[model samples]
Target: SYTKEQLMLAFSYMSYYGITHTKNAELILKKMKEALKTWKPFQEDDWEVVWGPAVYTMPFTIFNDAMMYVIQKKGAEGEYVIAIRGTNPVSISDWLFNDFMVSAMKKWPYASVEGRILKISESTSYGLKTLQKLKPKSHIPGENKTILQFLNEKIGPEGKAKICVTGHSKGGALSSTLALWLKDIQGVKLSQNIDISTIPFAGPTAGNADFADYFDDCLGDQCTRIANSLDIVPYAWNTNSLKKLKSIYISEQASVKPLLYQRALIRAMIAETKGKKYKQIKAETPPLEGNINPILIEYLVQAAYQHVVGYPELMGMMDDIPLTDIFEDAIAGLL
Candidate 1:
């Protein structure tokens, strides 16, 4: 198990992985060791990157983005930490499709390796789709175990080695889902095992209140969601009030405008060519960018900066200072 301080450092390391490519694992780790030395008691010899810089993709969808790496603390022996990377800011689809698309929470079946059933949010279920097919292979030297196999081997019935899942944004949601699967479906018996905790930065709400409650019950305070004050991604899919629900509904509808306009244009062209009178085709105006907030453009711009720049920097700096103390100051610097 890791102390809160160690986990905070893990979060920083994981966040650094977010912006970097998986192929640069050695370089990233080297840089992390050097940069982290400025923040805490330095130890370059304790950490080893054992597995990954693995890529995951869905078969039919364009959602081809995910990277993970496993690192072992030499001093701690069997303990393993898995860090999953989030959306790449350069991929417009990653932001437009994954982050901005709001959908209602729906029940999803979680069939375990042992064939037990549990329910989770639809989006979160989608988030874990790639992980479901993850298997062990030897691509990198001395790293031959898949995540599941590693967990089972390290965490025996007694559950001794610490497993910390860390991510940002979509990655955060997936890490949370992975924790739920380990505890509820895989029956990891977290009660008896070494700690299994998920620390997500700027993570969106995964599901409804009931789902949140269930997650809380399963992990208690172990699931730490670190949100930057200016990061608007975490405030998404709020179904609390009619007004907010209406805004979500409008946003969903707005996303379909391009398809709607295409169909309308085709119909209009057919009528014009056939010498038949046709009404003008009008596409529904997408609600102004921030119908969810009163400040509109300002909040949207700030939110963009938060997700892309501010949040990652803040997460990276956690190793040097207590995040709680400097959170506001960091956001202010960005503003």
Candidate 2:
């Protein structure tokens, strides 16, 4: 149970890294500087950059590397937020194989007959390997520690901080997966009353029904999945949810203008999910609906614009919107 302000702060980090890491290198650093003071969620000293601004390039495709950051708050009733950036449109080939490969499933690698035999998407499994392998990129203390090892020192025996996770787009898929994965850890999951808060924005289903079942069981009502109503991403791959894409532009008040390739492109993507069962983790009823990118209202690109800029605006936190200069071209080819 996090307050609205806490959730906004968590998203501010997601919003920052969401742009800074995924866009081109120079502007990425620029946003990182802007990030230092923009949200002002906490005192300067309170935010700890425990891990990342690191990039993980698994199975090597030179253009693509996923980015994540582990930021910790040190005080009473504090929490650690793992913010993952969304897919980089410049790295199309790598994204196709790792992040969007939805047909196959894999067993959780860390499970050695551990308590739940979690079955996740093979794509998710690859992402998990990369996520667990991420070491520090900054000169922060404990530079070589794994994410779990860092947690061990913080919450294993003594310190009692909550764990919070968030991201948007593909990052949303991984953030939710990471949160669920954290629960399966014998050392980390509750013995009595430990909390892990997950709030992922505009991500597709990460795994099978078993994975969703596992996620629901672990988090109960603690996981909040936020998605924009017209954003086609949250409906992806799940056969049931995918139906929404066909008529998404139609609403009670008016029908949004859809030019041509929006649904067709989505259909092409869903073809990859044919041989398996992909289920959405479910979002709050009546997903957030607001302004579509009027600039590209009828273009398929509007779908992505909804995903990137619309989330914060819909949440009344528009201060965190990523720079258009960096993201406009970054998303131009994506849809």
Candidate 3:
């Protein structure tokens, strides 16, 4: 979320980095400067730049019935490309949501462990809302109305638009849905029109059985699931809620170590305690691994149960929430 001025500064950095044939670096810089002045709000600290990359808000559109975040950056060819991030409804507080998930998975049957995690994906808010409401028309076609619409409008028809879509956790679910719907929806054909490829990280399952067929067809080999093997956020695939599914684990080797796994398990148990001492411990440790990256060990534990072992045991008291409404009430009250 860079301010307009910051964006212009970034554009200048892009100009210094390289030049493109389709775009004039000087002109782009000039336009950027003008835009900065015209856009107003010269400076604001509320905007944060994500690790040197361009930052943007996740966009939602009523017409498309989807939510996504786009990152615009200068490609090797000097032209701009859109990297779309999917939307998730679990809220942006990563630590809390992940800890909750870890506690939930521990309740699986250790006595008779069965089933494998098939597909882990989630529908976007638009899609979720559609599912919640049982809407007849699940996706939008032809009419692209929103900030994304305005951005896409800038693309030239002469060449295929380069676009990459991705999402983390819940947003990952939305990203998958958008990628699927964009290709099949007759009028929009967003996937067909652009050089479309998708990466959904920690996404949840979207449909039961029928929608699975459509998802496979729309993705058509361009969709890839990029997950942190230690991250338990995608374990919903093994749950009863999802239909026939399949999942391929994607992760870094560092996340799968035995030491890391044990640490993750302990963290999840601590998070479920719901006591002042547990809160005090968490306030100091905060669930992350180390200073630089802050790996969320709790999320990794949840992943281990669901994706690795298929949820075989109750690791914490809070693990009872899904089976009974009373536990759910207790967990909510504690939170």
Candidate 4:
């Protein structure tokens, strides 16, 4: 967790970098603070126990947990609306952060400004180790535990409950893991009562083919992976493993920017063409070089620097597959 002052400094630097509009930072920050407050732990009489942001990680080394919001809605009729969790992107702000990061990484001046997040290591940090721990020991008789256990523990193991998971970017990854972890390992009696649906937006690929297969089997049409064409985060992982899962790809036309969509496309292409053997691609071409905005350069430097220095997991490594082709296939399945 970061201090309020640190948070403010991050946003302030972003504002000056033009990642965030000066006019909108205050409102965005306010909303973020409100959300953070809402997610803060508190006890409820209907629930048994409450845990901190730490309850997310399981026993493995591959799984990581993001501290997201879990809301349980109760209706007058005794039915419960149990929404397990929702995730946000890299920055604290949800959709607003998406817009800022995407737009900032695409344009000038501010684009030249480096991002602070790149300063972190690329491998075996608390975050990555946590994610590693989350990887399931076995697809059968599942051993993974997530917030759902906490929820079930809270609501008591005796009753039926409806569960839905949602998130954006990194949050989406956590949400997907939670959804599947609960579905696969949930006790047969509890499994029968659990109705889980997951909607992950702009989420990176968390698991390989087997986990996705499990997701497709458990959730079927109920699970959805949504990605904005320009939001490179979700496209970071290849889905060649999951042959039949449901996915939704929103094009750049649906986004605020279209050319930015090409940025990811180019990244994918470069990664595919060069394989893992090539040095990370720095922004040196049109929209990135020459007249390229300094802000874009900064974002590029940050991204490139991360590949060179930050947590290895944080860097997006192209898995040698042509992503556009893979995306096209997934798009066809979705439509």
Give per-residue lDDT, candidate 3, residue 323. Answer: 18
Candidate maximizing TM-score: 2
At residue 306, give the lDDT of candidate 1: 50
lDDT of the candidates, in the order given: 0.48, 0.61, 0.32, 0.33
Q: Report the Cα RMSD per candidate.
A: 11.7, 4.8, 17.7, 18.3
Query: TM-score for every candidate vs. truth?
Result: 0.61, 0.77, 0.38, 0.41
Candidate 4 has its poorest 10 consecutive residues by lDDT at 280-289
Off by over 4 Å in 2: 1-36, 40-45, 57-64, 89-100, 109-118, 138-141, 157-159, 188-193, 250-265, 283-285, 291-294, 320-322, 325-335
Q: Rate residue 278 of model 1 by lDDT.
A: 11
Regions more than 4 Å wrong, model 3 = 1-68, 75-148, 156-159, 186-192, 237-335
Ranking by lDDT: 2, 1, 4, 3
Residue range 194-291, candidate 1, lDDT tens digits: 66777665555565544555566677666766665444455443422111211231353232112343334333333322311111101011211322
Q: How far is candidate 3 from the true structure (C-alpha RMSD, Å)?
A: 17.7
Better of 3 and 4 by TM-score: 4
Q: Which 10 consecutive positions of candidate 3 have the poorest summed lDDT?
A: 276-285
- lDDT by residue (1-335, candidate 3, tens digit) is 54222232222222111111111223333433343333323233122111112112223321222222233443332123222322212222232234343222121111111342212112233343332222111122212334334334545333356555554444455555555544443244232355665555445444323344445545656666544333444434323211111112223533323345444544454444322111000011112121112232333332433321221111122231121221222122212
Clashes of each: 0, 0, 18, 30
